[PDB]
Amino acid sequence: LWGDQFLSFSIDNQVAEKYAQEIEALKEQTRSMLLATGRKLADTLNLIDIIERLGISYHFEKEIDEILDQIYNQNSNCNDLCTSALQFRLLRQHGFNISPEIFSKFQDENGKFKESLASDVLGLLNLYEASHVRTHADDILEDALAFSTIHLESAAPHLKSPLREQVTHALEQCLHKGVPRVETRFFISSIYDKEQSKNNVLLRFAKLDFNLLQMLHKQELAQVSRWWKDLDFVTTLPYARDRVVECYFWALGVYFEPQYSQARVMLVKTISMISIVDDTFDAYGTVKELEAYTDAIQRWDINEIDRLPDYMKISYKAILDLYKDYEKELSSAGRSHIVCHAIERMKEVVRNYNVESTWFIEGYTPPVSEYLSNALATTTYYYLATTSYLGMKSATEQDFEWLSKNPKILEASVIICRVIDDTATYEVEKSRGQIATGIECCMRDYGISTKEAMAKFQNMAETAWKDINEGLLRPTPVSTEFLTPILNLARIVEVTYIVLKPHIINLLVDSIKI
Ligand SMILES: [Mg+2]
Numbered sequence: 204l205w206g207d208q209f210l211s212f213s214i215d216n217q218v219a220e221k222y223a224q225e226i227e228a229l230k231e232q233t234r235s236m237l238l239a240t241g242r243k244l245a246d247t248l249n250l251i252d253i254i255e256r257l258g259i260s261y262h263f264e265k266e267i268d269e270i271l272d273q274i275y276n277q278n279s280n281c282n283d284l285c286t287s288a289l290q291f292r293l294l295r296q297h298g299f300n301i302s303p304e305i306f307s308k309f310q311d312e313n314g315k316f317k318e319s320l321a322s323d324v325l326g327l328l329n330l331y332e333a334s335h336v337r338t339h340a341d342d343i344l345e346d347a348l349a350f351s352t353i354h355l356e357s358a359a360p361h362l363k364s365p366l367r368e369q370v371t372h373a374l375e376q377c378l379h380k381g382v383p384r385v386e387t388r389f390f391i392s393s394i395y396d397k398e399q400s401k402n403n404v405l406l407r408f409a410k411l412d413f414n415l416l417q418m419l420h421k422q423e424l425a426q427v428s429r430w431w432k433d434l435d436f437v438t439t440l441p442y443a444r445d446r447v448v449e450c451y452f453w454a455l456g457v458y459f460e461p462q463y464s465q466a467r468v469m470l471v472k473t474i475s476m477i478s479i480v481d482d483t484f485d486a487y488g489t490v491k492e493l494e495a496y497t498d499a500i501q502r503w504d505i506n507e508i509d510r511l512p513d514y515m516k517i518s519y520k521a522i523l524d525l526y527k528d529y530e531k532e533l534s535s536a537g538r539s540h541i542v543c544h545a546i547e548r549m550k551e552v553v554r555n556y557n558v559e560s561t562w563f564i565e566g567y568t569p570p571v572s573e574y575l576s577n578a579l580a581t582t583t584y585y586y587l588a589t590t591s592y593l594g595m596k597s598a599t600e601q602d603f604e605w606l607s608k609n610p611k612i613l614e615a616s617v618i619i620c621r622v623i624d625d626t627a628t629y630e631v632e633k634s635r636g637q638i639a640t641g642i643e644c645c646m647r648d649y650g651i652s653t654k655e656a657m658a659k660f661q662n663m664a665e666t667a668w669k670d671i672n673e674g675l676l677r678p679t680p681v682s683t684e685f686l687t688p689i690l691n692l693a694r695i696v697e698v699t700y701i702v703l704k705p706h707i708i709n710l711l712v713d714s715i716k717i
Pocket residue numbers: 481482484485556
């Protein structure tokens with residue numbers, strides 16, 4: 204419902220250059236802040252936390268890492284909940300397996316959190332955020348979420364602004380599980396901007412940087428929108444909607460940095476394309492047509508097009524063409540040889556789409572284990588994760604080989620999307636006759652109520668998050684650069700099922716008022 208609002212974006216080079224020039228000054232100035240010698244732990248942690256929440260930490264990957272490494276190594280006891288929880292969270296998010304023992308001093312000989320901390324809002328907030336980065340080994344943090352949650356909920360109504368808005372927001376969306384750009388936009392405009400103790404250099408820096416990057420995101424969105432119009436699916440395939448803007452939001456959620464410009468464009472096209480296919484199997488193709496389509500996809504030829512009805516011929520050709528473009532784009536860098544990994548994942552998605560169709564027609568309700576073996580791939584997550592690597596100039600063959608083994612971190616990301624999707628779309632899918640819905644299989648397989656089935660599904664998502672958190676800890680199998688996209692895919696789930704309009708507006712329409 205966007206229209207020609209994004210067909211084309213004429214970037215006024217003057218404003219961009221001004222922004223860039225000043226950003227360079229602010230960047231160097233901020234760098235010097237990070238390298239300040241005589242700073243206290245609390246101050247150093249808050250500085251890093253602020254730069255990250257402001258969405259400008261990508262400029263200081265090395266600096267922040269070296270500083271955090273020093274903090275990890277010195278193991279200093281801060282003694283106060285606020286700093287301890289923050290220290291724990293930042294180290295964990297950066298792969299440092301800091302021991303949860305740092306929380307023992309805030310617990311009774313029973314391991315329960317000293318209820319006396321219940322009046323320490325700042326400590327509770329940082330503990331709340333830290334509880335979301337826990338692993339299966341962090342037994343000490345078992346009751347951290349419930350503890351901080353109940354007390355923050357109680358204190359919230361009487362807190363000053365913007366602290367109150369920060370707490371209220373956190374309770375609805377924790378930092379660790381939120382989409383980066385979405386959380387950055389919120390922190391900048393709704394919190395830091397209204398913070399009495401704000402650092403003006405950092406705020407100015409954050410605003411300019413966000414706005415400048417937004418211009419690039421707009422060029423990409425415009426470029427891809429033109430690409431979509433050329434395909435002219437609107438008239439040739441009147442059963443699919445112009446979801447391009449939504450598809451772009453997803454790509455933006457996976458990575459927003461300027462270096463991933465090519466990657467985002469490639470990713471958007473894939474998301475758009477597979478969306479067409481999903482529509483085909485869901486409400487247009489007949490039993491026979493779908494079987495013919497699944498086969499054509501597995502063969503991946505073109506001569507197979509003759510066995511497909513006209514509408515499917517358009518889709519099929521476009522898909523094959525898209526991958527040819529990908530191969531061409533990567534030719535200059537000699538990376539075209541990796542595209543096959545994405546194709547293999549697409550074939551997988553289509554096979555499982557077909558199987559899902561078959562299950563629906565037969566009225567089959569498989570046990571959970573069997574349901575998942577097919578339903579996990581239908582989320583398209585393995586496929587999208589593989590696709591995100593295509594445009595990443597550093598993604599080597601080894602990285603793709605690791606990804607093909609279905610790494611636990613990827614598996615967890617996929618599971619999160621699956622169980623959450625099933626919990627949300629259950630009602631709609633049931634009234635549609637889809638008795639092969641995750642929640643349905645769960646109920647029958649275990650012999651439990653819908654409520655209990657959904658509760659089990661939520662537990663699976665929780666378990667998966669802990670797995671993701673563990674998968675981020677050093678030593679990582681591949682560079683962190685390749686783990687973030689998977690983590691971001693899981694974050695997108697949290698945002699899509701708490702719909703995209705407000706985020707699209709805040710991220711791609713409205714700039715932050717400087
Ligand atoms: Mg479908």
